[PDB]
């Protein structure tokens, strides 16, 4: 039962760390996607001009 408590705490800590890593990667990929869409917007505006 004790080990179970330690494993639950470790699982929660690992889940928090992995959530932080996943959200960091997601923010990076979101920034890249926004940059790509903004560049595409610039290209579309140039084409219209």
């Amino acid at each position: 039962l004790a080990d179970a408590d330690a494993m639950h705490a470790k699982a929660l800590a690992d889940a928090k760390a992995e959530s932080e890593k996943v959200t960091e990667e997601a923010k990076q990929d979101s920034e890249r996607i926004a940059a790509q869409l903004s560049e595409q917007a610039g290209s579309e505006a140039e084409r219209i001009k």
């Binding site: 917007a41 579309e44 505006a45 219209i48 001009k49």
Partner: protein, 50 residues
């Protein structure tokens, strides 16, 4: 894209106005020659000076 289309429309309308005015201007220049051009064409079809 909407902003680009709007600015393209604005420049299109401005250019349309400017070109219409400038064509109205060049109309007088064209009319200045119309007579000589017509005389030359008549002479060319007749094969002799009009």
């Amino acid at each position: 894209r909407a902003q680009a289309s709007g600015e393209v429309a604005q420049t299109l309308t401005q250019a349309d106005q400017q070109l219409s005015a400038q064509g109205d201007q060049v109309r007088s220049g064209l009319e200045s020659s119309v007579d000589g051009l017509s005389a030359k064409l008549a002479s060319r079809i007749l094969g002799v000076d009009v």
